[PDB]
Design a protein around this ligand. Structure first.
Ligand SMILES: O=c1c(-c2ccc(O)cc2)coc2cc(O[C@@H]3O[C@H](CO)[C@@H](O)[C@H](O)[C@H]3O)ccc12
Ligand SMILES: O=c1c(-c2ccc(O)cc2)coc2cc(O[C@@H]3O[C@H](CO)[C@@H](O)[C@H](O)[C@H]3O)ccc12
Lengths: 494, 494, 494, 494
């Protein structure tokens, strides 16, 4: 039930957002953001750098001062504000979904039904938490009354990637604002537009100036400035494992700001011989190909028990061959372009590595159109653990299918990775499902499904897939600083 | 009610502890540990380095393998084991208190009545948590059953300082073991002995081999090896802010292991004009001078409202002058030696800086004996915020007294620091107490008391005094890795 | 900032509400509801009895069937629905506040600014809980996976009084609906109208039929039918202690349905000699006189320390004398009529008892107008604990002022009661505040304030003032039935 | 690994236990307790009545006075005391197990390995909770600091049955003492001895006098006195649904004391066609026959899918026939006598009713020896839902086997009962397991197991099987009274 999109939405916001006002970079520099479907420049965007970050941080610090409107505001009112923002986003849903597709490349039907819905659910969920994250009264030894305050951690730097621009913004703003923090946010140069428009809505909703500040720009500049800033209390970063390390090192080298990381993965999707064949095949397809394969938790290692391997591979290849690649604004399109040229080439490079290393190319394997960054849905069979495409995050429409015999075997192989973001298990058997879900070293284990996200269930990596959790009650922890208050009393009684 | 101490306890453990066995360093090197009261070498200790740490980590990894005794053991049995350890420590309480005093220098009466009691309470507290830290069942959207497992984070490197050897070991082992982790622990070269003996008790209690491993040695070697290790999942460090940064950088540079830090402070102790004079004076004395001034949360900035300043200073100086410095085994001794020569000199250097910068030396200010590292209880009056001794952690028997007028003023001054470990407020007024406890940026705010610790109340730093919390339920968080399991079900019902 | 009221709002709903439809009583009987300001009949209302209750219960049971729209609905959607209801109530705020005043008698300014705001905050608060009340995953001994589901308790009978018609409905509906229960609600015969209109909004908001059912009528009929019903799972009752006992007896005599009770009180308001005189006097006045004295937690025993007694009494009498009694629709009116003739006479009876027993009548003491049920603000001084007006809930504009000397004395006197709903302490002293708040046996202790309610803080009685709590997270407990699920697994691991 | 029992343990305690002293009944009356294996009187026991209960309540009230040793004691010390008690019980384990068997009739091997182990785990579990049940600090609207104290509910009347004498005492004392309450306990006239000995241990462990008081006697006297007492704050009763109602009525008729109930059941044990036959058969046997069939949660309705019915019945009959009935002190004995003559006759009466109503008697059906109260393991086949033995709790060695076809069918039949204590599901299928566990209306649903209890997992009834939960964190709720404290502050900040 999807409203017709404006396939060329107007852009209203393309500057740096500080104190609820729009600003050029101090340097006046700008950078183009491209439509990945055409390769054409959509528009120019203010290129924030250290000096702009510095202004944003000072605005946030000021907004976070004891006695400020934001600090004095009732927690429940923070909730009202988050709900207002959600309402405004819903009002402009059709526009935002189109803009998202324009700048990112994902099919408009998905932007509208999936990304925007999830954004709304996330904000509305966290709205509910604003006045419900209690501290404790504690029965300490001796004649004392002891309790904890759950205070905001303070000025939060938030750095988000380009694969889910609006959704990532929501996953960050929701918990941070619900718990009374202020933020300086760096959005991805590939996809700055939708986030900037939301800032307009943040203003419209009534958030005090300085509470949310957005700085578009490049990573080694604006991003590094946030990570290294002496007055940023906490940084949250979603992106590559490689940059994640830069972030944590920067935090250690600067002011020991608190850090959470949502990084990449090479998530194993395990199909047992008793799985429902049709369901497993469609889910495995979805698990890998969703969002042009641009998911950190993509099912990029499809383990299939030998007894069903041949059939599973056949059906998978057929499903991949029938997948509709094309104009993201066309309702029939299942798969849009990759986000940019760098990704485009990286993916082609990996495909080549797959060919080179002896994986069986079963379909696709090349460019899918001659404008934009479209790539054919690609499937490799007989993939081995030692192969590059079996170890490294491809982040494109490239599926790896591996064969295994025993449950003990697949556990060891699935877990033999420095990633651990997610995993899935397809089986009808109670015991197998429980054995596997316990044994897999991943932040999320899905059973007979994949990519099931709920605002109420935490998500995050084991190992080098990250640290900390987002969503659910757990998502509040990293945005809270704990204070113990311990008072002498005349005589302690139970 | 204190048993007479053996003033020369025999040493039974001085090697590296791995798989419940004692080992020499691979290099066979050893290092002397000194009795700070005499300057004499107590004994030689195995000097662990990278290769030793590597063996310890492998032992831990093995003990943490799925299906291992430690992994399969009932959570409640982990609790039994912690209680057994506490029992064994209590059995050997008199010995351990003596050994603690011998190697550290703190008065034996305090070791016995304070340190060991606190050790016992910590372990017994955490024993109770072992089977009570629940995950969640979560009402996620759609036809799914979603829940979280609270799993052990895994192999935990733990690095502890010398000021509270036994207590720090307990604050680390308790939460870690209660939640089913394994540890590789680096103890301080100044104070290795008591921790090594406890390892014997850990074996005696029945903990599986590899669950707890201890590596004595130096920081830039053994410590750095742990922080940088590729198979250590989590590191907890207590020590200086300076080294804290090294730790977090090492974590970012290696495997993105999770990090918690308990660092230094320059905690403000605020005396309002309506405070109970006698109580405030005694508590302020205690707040600073306790444990030879070797507390991260020492009340090293004593702010006194002008109307009571003169009297407060007078009484403080008197109390300081009457403080008994001497042999830690003598029941009359209130203050032993500083831990070692480096600290000895650092403190003298700070005292000199205080004189140099124009603070009023009101008493002490020099060496207190000609053997060992004894320092006169020292008090500076009319201290100004810009002074070095008002900004930097001295970690010795050196009190700073500052004068202020208004509550608004003292809040801003107290908070004007990059530390934020603790603070205290002395007042009879309800409103003043609440205003201050809310406004002070510190991990713990004490009201009309100081240095009140309870195993049930969390403790840790704001700002550069650290990150994360120890003690209480909060102490379990950093030792837990959260897994979401999300299962497709036929039809979800409330 | 209050919109002008329609002083004769039209009535749209006066029937029994079942399955989102309006019905006459099976008997076709009706009863008048009166405007307490004039004594005139506002309108006729369906008089529900056992047979009507029976229909309502069956509708609720049906709506609660496994697989029903209400049972299958996402928890988060329950939240959306509660927020919609809140929105609809806000839309019709001016109307509802006027209708509330018309039927109940409270000043329209209060209905609008207080009752309706509180209604909105309650519903919006609970909307937030709907998908956040987790069960647990539990580390049980042995090779099992054990967890709990927090299920709805089921069909909930809810019986509410007349003193805060809209608010009481909110306090009941919020937690019940947030946790996915269904309700059969009995509203007070004195004040049925506003609750019935809200039922219309419940329908409009989109709640499935049968989820909320309302049955107007009398207590010994409709109420008793709910309490004794064989298919009602849980009953919540707010009202007199006397009827509370009937309710619990009925539950025990029928099907052992779960019970919570919010009953009366005789709450002590304790003014220490160091209190802020002006603040304490105004708050004490408010504490007693609010809502025509018709609050279960009214501060009906004002304990004043002897040193300030005379002045406090003087100021209190003056404040009471200046209190404006009259037409609730007039913006200048502070106090409307009592709810009905029965209460009117009960109160006059108590005033007479006060005179008879030797309390000092300091002002008021009689009827305040010759139409409606208006009573003069009345103050008794030198009240003694043994006096009837010091022991029994008057529920009218009748203040008792008692004198005391010591803190130990006042504690014992305040606690010497079979009520324990609330209490208050006025003092500037930290220690006194802490001593008293710990020692007073009451569900809520206010310090330097009174009647401070927040949707996030629980409220309920000690002793015979009730059992269970409303508001906050605690309010969810009585609406939840806990199921343990314990599953054999192949091998349990931490 | 079981120590040889003293088959005639000496009795040391047979009086009323008040203030850690032993007393005769005021009336000096005594009653015989019988050995159900022989029918011989073991010894005489003080017969407590109202006057004795009154003394016990006063002692408890006194021990619960503000400032008393028990009220002032550190929460953690409560835990130490519970652990000491557990230790003492373990010390006297062999003795207690024998005495339990002597008075109750259950096999000594079971008393020793099961009952006593469970007792120890329960107490040790709750010891850990003593200082961990936090209240909350709450982010309330306005300039206030609001928090809750979790206080003890107070004087707790606890009434326990005879089927698990020691275990029931533990399930009651653990949560109550851990949370700082005091108790007056009524133990069953059939089995008073072990609970009285434990009182001796309670004294030995160091519990202040009056904290635990035990009154042996009859139900309509001592029990009723507790339920109706004006100074008992809370009552917990385990027993028959019929008496449960008397208890709740008594609570409503007296002082509105808080009530929790653990009542009977007719729990369905559902065997699907894909279940592991051998496992299901042995578990179904255990589910029903354990403890002479005297478990409230006995699997007394065994539903078997038609395709496996014949085989399942055959194997069940064989297993029942081979069950060893005899002297509970003989290591070969699987089943002892029933608890007394009343039960003996009730069970025979039910067996006759089964024959009479047309159930197929497949084995047993009569008396098993001519001394004591031994009954043949009895199995009825082709049982129909309308039969009396299918509806009423038999509480003896009498198995009902019913046949069903579809999963929808069995859900409706299993749930068609006014009981709802427990249920079980045997199946290998993931979906079936999840569907059934969600749909069954029972406090505990076991999957592929039965009678799996853990101190950490809650247990209790839906419907008329009771209200409230015992064990786990949930077991603490009914022993806690919640107080909100709400303090005016100068300026509220997040
Ligand atoms: O990969 C996904 C991420 C994500 C978020 C943060 C990261 O760092 C990485 C990935 C977030 O949401 C997702 C939703 C996805 O699919 C959608 O999932 C939702 C609910 O799970 C459904 O409403 C839709 O049917 C389905 O299209 C798939 C992948 C992701
Ligand atoms: O500073 C203290 C630390 C500590 C621990 C870790 C750190 O990193 C820094 C400090 C631990 O324990 C302490 C106990 C202290 O005092 C004792 O504290 C306890 C309770 O607080 C009392 O029972 C004793 O009487 C009192 O002397 C004072 C300071 C510290």
């Amino acid at each position: 039930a999807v409203p017709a999109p404006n396939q060329q939405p107007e852009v209203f916001c393309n500057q740096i957002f500080i104190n609820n006002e729009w600003h050029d970079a101090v340097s006046r520099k700008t950078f183009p953001t491209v439509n990945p479907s055409t390769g054409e420049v959509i528009c120019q965007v203010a290129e924030g750098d250290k000096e702009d970050v510095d202004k944003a941080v000072k605005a946030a610090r000021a907004a976070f001062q004891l006695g400020s409107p934001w600090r004095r505001m009732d927690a429940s009112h923070r909730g009202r504000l988050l709900n207002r923002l959600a309402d405004l986003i819903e009002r402009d849903r059709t526009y935002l979904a189109a803009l998202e597709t324009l700048d990112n490349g994902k099919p408009y039907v998905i932007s509208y039904l999936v990304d925007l819905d999830m954004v709304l659910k996330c904000l509305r969920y966290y709205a509910g938490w604003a006045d419900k994250y209690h501290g404790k009264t504690i029965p300490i030894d001796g004649d004392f009354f002891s309790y904890t305050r759950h205070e905001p951690v303070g000025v939060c730097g938030q750095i988000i990637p380009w694969n889910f621009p609006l959704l990532m913004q929501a996953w960050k703003l929701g918990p941070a604002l619900a718990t009374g923090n202020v933020v300086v946010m760096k959005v991805a140069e590939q996809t700055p537009l939708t986030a900037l428009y939301v800032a307009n809505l943040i203003k419209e909703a009534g958030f005090p100036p300085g509470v949310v500040n957005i700085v578009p720009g490049f990573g080694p500049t604006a991003g590094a400035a946030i990570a290294s800033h002496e007055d940023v209390d906490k940084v949250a970063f979603t992106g590559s494992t490689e940059i994640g390390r830069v972030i944590q090192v920067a935090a250690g080298s600067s002011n020991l700001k608190r850090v959470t990381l949502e990084l990449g993965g090479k998530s194993p999707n395990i199909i047992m011989s008793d799985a429902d064949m049709d369901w497993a095949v469609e889910q495995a397809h979805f698990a890998l190909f969703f969002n042009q394969g641009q998911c950190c938790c993509a099912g990029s290692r499809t383990f299939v028990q030998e007894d069903i391997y041949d059939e599973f591979v056949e059906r998978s290849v057929a499903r991949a061959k029938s997948r509709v690649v094309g104009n993201p604004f066309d309702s029939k399109t299942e798969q849009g372009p990759q986000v940019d040229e760098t990704q485009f080439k990286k993916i082609l490079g990996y495909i080549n590595t797959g060919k080179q290393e002896g994986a069986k190319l079963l379909c696709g394997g090349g460019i899918a159109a001659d404008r934009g960054y479209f790539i054919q849905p690609t499937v490799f069979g007989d993939v081995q653990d030692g192969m590059t495409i079996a170890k490294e995050e491809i982040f494109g429409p490239v599926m790896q299918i591996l064969k295994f015999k025993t449950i003990e075997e697949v556990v060891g192989r699935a877990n033999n990775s420095t990633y651990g973001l997610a995993a899935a298990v397809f089986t009808k058997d109670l015991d197998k499902a429980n054995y596997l879900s316990q044994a897999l070293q991943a932040g999320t284990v899905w059973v007979n499904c994949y990519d099931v996200f709920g605002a109420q269930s935490p998500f995050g990596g084991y190992k080098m897939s990250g640290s900390g959790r987002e969503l659910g009650e757990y998502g509040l922890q990293a945005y809270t600083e704990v204070k113990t208050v311990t008072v002498k009393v005349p005589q302690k009684n139970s």
